[PDB]
Structure formats: structure tokens, C-alpha cells
Design a protein around this ligand. Structure first.
Ligand SMILES: [Mg+2]
Ligand SMILES: [Mg+2]
Ligand code: NA
Ligand code: NA
Ligand code: NA
Ligand code: NA
Lengths: 409, 204
């Protein structure tokens, strides 16, 4: 517990940019794109206001558009007079991927038409399209193969406080070890993480901070309408904050909360508000109506585990169950606890062999061990119960490919 | 029940089946079979023939059947086993786990075939586990997969009975003959004996 992320003070003008969303759509071969940026303002709405969105590739301005406020008519009562959408055509855009994280910079200027900049906001833009078609998850029209890992925000000395150095260190090692994707198990991350995955190039699954694993049955709260509002905020505010980051390619509804009607409602909300990214969610059996991707945790390659209600079928058999057509990407596999990863190669052979087997995210990146000091004052790695904590789950907090100080296992 | 149409020896295999001048002759082999056997309950699936590639004549006949007798699915393996002329993926000799990616008509592992992008049909091998000589090695492997995968619905082993013919030696004693044993040439030697049982019905 505590104030474990940054605290800051922001000054905004009375007439200001209150939100902005950037989308990139493409022609059939990705040789042409349209960048569309919807901008909303709060404050003093007057005819002289304008929005200029300019797109830069390095120090070169590749495109720009200026428009007064007032969006298209949307219904019988009119349109959003406090919003404007700029559309910029971009030819032969440099596409973003984890392989080549090409980025442009979009600058959003709120200003008077005669030239006074009120304020400007901006973001890195990655031209990429994410879509599932014919059962496959495609990125820029090509099917991905996710070499993913789940990563908690953990530091042996600072607990859950993240810092730039540490994040960088993890992203370098991930890449140096041929990972191309990370799942935010199981909550939105510190904001700099996204900046870094955008820039270094990692595909990201951004996950709502919703986990009710300990309930009995697990969907007791998620199927309860009285918990819809609390859950809604966790999903909606995440999307509102992270929707312009190219690194985020998939949204997840949370983790181990069973399958409740709240999930269905929220799945739909995202699909309406942000059609650019698939939505996934493993609870309730990993292939529920609340997921665009079959995203089991620990389903084996050839061996079925037919538990009642939420069986974990062999991943190869799961893809072809009668009527199933979705791609399958394990949200968690290859539990790296202690001396483990036995059978890892079996997964990779299947993934390469079956098109719709598109990978998975290893559980997990770093052991959650904490440093304790002995009588002599020498540091030692502690786990569950080492702080008097009880009940506790002992060494179950250490499941990483790397030790808490980033030394590899 | 399978129409008497096989043009395996053409190059390419569908040279006649894709030619409309052969549509009439092919059509009678299909339509006349259906006219004859359509009242038999034992017939559950119609087949457009065998090893004749995939030509437009197959598509035309596939629809004819679907149109006159909606009661039984239509299958046909030619052209890759999963063409538009078949309601069932029905490969011959596709393996359980191993892919055989031949160009144009690959034979995927059956487990994988089921799940190719967009595929939804059931898969029943029209021929598998070629029982020629001392064979049937790996037969359990197919059965374990058919039981584990709902859409893997079995197959037809190749084949029931050895096609050997009886010849008689000088003393008049009979012996089992195969390709070339009658002066026939060219011939394919022992490839006519692929049965689970010998010609006389004794089991292998
Ligand atoms: Mg305990
Ligand atoms: Mg010969
Ligand atoms: Na694959
Ligand atoms: Na754990
Ligand atoms: Na089966
Ligand atoms: Na033969």
C-alpha cells in the first residue's frame, strides 16, 4: 500500500484540450493511410478557436490539418460543438511493429485562428493496424507469432515502485532474449512503460485492474450488477488513458474473475469505443463470449485437462472444437517457478506448425522476491511468510525467468 | 457410394474433369448412380469418384447432387481434399501429426488441417493406413487422435482385400500372383496387394 507512483502538478489553461484520440486506417496494401485525430475541448467555446494537428517524421512535417470546432451532426439534437476531427492523409507511411518501431510525432495545437497557441498536447504515433481476420490476429496484414512474457511491476528493494532504469533494463533483456510482447499482468502499468514499449518496440496487452480470484465461485462479483460500476471504471479509465499508444495492441478485461455479465457488457463497451484493437479475457474458460482470442492459462500442447465447466483442452484440439474459429494465444504458459520450463520446446513447435496457434505469454518475467537483511546486515532473498505474513503462499511469488535483481535463471 | 470416375493417369490429374466436353460422360456416371441407389439406407454419403484432380465438372456435379438429394452429404478428395466440391475434408494418407506440404495439394497433419484459417468441416480420411504387406505400423496413432478430436470422425483403411489372382504351377498347384505375373507390362508389381486380408479371406 501507499503512494507508489508519481505525484505531479499540471497547469492547464481554462480553454483546453480535454481529450484527444488518434487513429490510423490503411488501404489494402498499407501504402496509404489516413490519420484521424478527434479532439475535445473544455472551457470557452468561441468561433475563433481552431485545432491544428501536424504530423512529423523527425524534423520533417509530413502532414497537417486545421479546422474550427464543431463535429458532424450525430443526431436529432445536432453534433459536438466542443469537438473536431482532423483527417490527414499520409502516403507510404513507415509502419510500426515490434520488429521496427517506426514512430511519427503528432502535435495537437489548440489556438486562435489568428495565430495564438493556447496550449499544445502531443503523442508518438505508430502507424499500424491490428485486426483478426479469418481466425488470425494480423498486424499490418501479417499474422503475428507472439513471443510474450507476463511482467509484474516488482523491485526487490522498492516493492511495487517502478523507475526508468529498471523498466529499461527489463525491456532490453526481453528483447535481447527474443521476446516481442508483454502482458501487463494484471493492471495498467506506470505510464512510462508504454512510452518505452512504443519506442523500443514490444506488443502490449493492456489489462484492467480487475482480479477477484478468491471469490467463490470466481464470478460472484463480476456477474453482480452492483459491481458493474466499480468494474466499469477500471476498464473505461484504462482505455481512456492508453488508447493512443501504438504498443498496446490488445485490451484485456482483467484476470481470474470468472465470467460475469459485467464482462460481457464491458467487452462490448470497448468494442464500441475502440474498434482498433481486439479484446481478450481468460476467465470462465478462456473462450467465452467476452473474448476475441482463445486465451487460456496453462493449457498443455497435446494433453487435455477436462475440468468441469472450465476445461483446459490441448491447445491444438481447442482450435478445432465444433464451431470454433478464433486465434489462440496463451495469456499464461510455461510456469517458470524454480527449476522449470521443462517442455518449453513442445509449445514452440506447435506454435510454428499451426497457423492459429499464435503464441503466448510466459508466466512470468521476474521473481517477486524481496530483500531482507540478516543480523550481520547481509541481504537475502525473502518470499511468502518471511515477514510474519500469514496465511501466505510461500515461494509461489517466485515464478520468474529472471531473479529479482535481473540476473537470469 | 462412389461414381465410377477415376482419371488418375492424366497430366495434370484434372485434364478431363476440368474440360466441359467431358462433362456429359462424367455426369452420367454420377447421376445414374444416384438414380439407382438413392433408396438405400446404408448409403450415407455420395462420392464424386477418385483421383481425378479437381475440375469444374466436379463442382457442377457436386451441386447437382446436393440439389436432387439433400439427404446425404457429398464428398470428393481430388484437388487437395478440401475443395469446393466436398462437404467433408477427406484426404488420403494424410498423417496424424506430420505435415506433407506438397505444392498445390499438401497433405496436412489431420489435427492441423481441421483448424486451418476459416476451415470448419469434419475430416474423415477417405483412405489411410495403407495395409500392404507387413504394415499398419502407427495405426493406434490415428485412433487416439480420432477419439480426442471431435471433428476427426474416422476414416477408411486402404484396403480390405489383397488383389492377388490365382495361377497354377507345372504340377497344377495354385499360387498367388501379382502385377507382371501374366506377362502384363508395364505393371505395378505387388502394389495390387494392400489388404487387411489375403485374397482368400484369411486375415493378415
Ligand atoms: Mg499457506
Ligand atoms: Mg513397373
Ligand atoms: Na502459429
Ligand atoms: Na505466483
Ligand atoms: Na473424433
Ligand atoms: Na494399390
Amino acid at each position: 500500500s501507499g503512494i507508489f507512483r508519481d505525484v505531479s502538478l499540471l497547469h492547464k489553461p481554462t480553454t483546453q484540450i480535454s481529450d484527444f484520440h488518434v487513429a490510423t486506417r490503411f488501404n489494402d496494401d498499407f501504402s496509404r493511410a489516413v490519420l484521424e485525430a478527434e479532439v475535445q475541448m473544455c472551457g470557452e467555446l468561441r468561433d475563433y478557436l481552431r485545432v491544428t494537428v501536424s504530423l512529423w517524421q523527425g524534423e520533417t512535417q509530413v502532414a497537417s490539418g486545421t479546422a474550427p470546432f464543431g463535429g458532424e451532426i450525430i443526431d436529432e439534437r445536432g453534433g459536438y460543438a466542443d469537438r473536431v476531427t482532423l483527417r490527414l492523409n499520409v502516403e507510404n507511411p513507415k509502419l510500426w511493429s515490434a520488429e521496427i518501431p517506426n514512430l511519427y510525432r503528432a502535435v495537437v495545437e489548440l489556438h486562435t485562428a489568428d495565430g495564438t497557441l493556447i496550449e499544445a498536447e502531443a503523442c508518438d504515433v505508430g502507424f499500424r493496424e491490428v485486426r483478426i481476420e479469418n481466425g488470425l490476429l494480423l498486424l499490418n496484414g501479417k499474422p503475428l507469432l507472439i513471443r510474450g512474457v507476463n511482467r509484474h511491476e516488482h523491485h526487490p528493494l522498492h516493492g511495487q515502485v517502478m523507475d526508468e532504469q529498471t523498466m529499461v533494463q527489463d525491456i532490453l533483456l526481453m528483447k535481447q532474449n527474443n521476446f516481442n510482447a508483454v502482458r501487463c499482468s494484471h493492471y495498467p502499468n506506470h505510464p512510462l512503460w508504454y512510452t518505452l514499449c512504443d519506442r523500443y518496440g514490444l506488443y502490449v496487452v493492456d489489462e484492467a485492474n480487475i482480479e477477484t480470484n478468491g471469490m467463490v465461485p470466481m464470478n460472484r462479483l463480476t456477474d453482480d450488477p452492483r459491481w458493474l460500476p466499480a468494474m466499469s471504471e477500471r476498464v473505461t479509465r484504462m482505455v481512456q488513458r492508453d488508447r493512443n499508444h501504438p504498443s498496446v495492441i490488445i485490451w484485456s478485461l482483467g484476470n481470474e474473475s470468472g465470467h460475469g455479465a459485467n464482462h460481457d457488457a464491458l467487452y462490448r463497451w470497448i468494442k464500441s469505443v475502440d474498434p482498433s484493437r481486439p479484446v481478450q479475457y481468460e476467465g470462465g474458460g478462456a473462450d467465452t463470449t467476452a473474448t476475441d482470442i482463445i486465451c487460456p492459462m496453462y493449457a498443455r500442447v497435446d494433453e487435455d485437462q477436462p475440468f468441469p465447466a472450465v476445461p483446459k483442452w490441448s491447445i491444438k484440439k481447442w482450435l478445432s472444437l465444433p464451431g470454433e474459429t478464433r486465434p489462440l494465444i496463451l495469456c499464461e504458459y510455461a510456469h517458470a517457478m524454480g527449476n522449470s520450463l521443462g517442455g518449453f520446446a513442445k509449445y514452440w513447435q506447435a506454435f510454428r506448425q499451426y497457423p492459429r496457434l499464435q503464441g503466448g505469454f510466459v508466466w512470468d518475467w521476474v521473481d517477486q522476491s524481496l530483500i531482507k537483511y540478516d543480523e550481520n546486515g547481509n541481504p537475502w532473498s525473502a518470499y511468502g511468510g518471511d515477514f510474519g505474513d500469514t496465511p501466505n503462499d510461500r515461494q509461489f511469488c517466485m515464478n520468474g525467468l529472471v531473479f529479482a535483481d535481473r540476473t537470469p535463471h
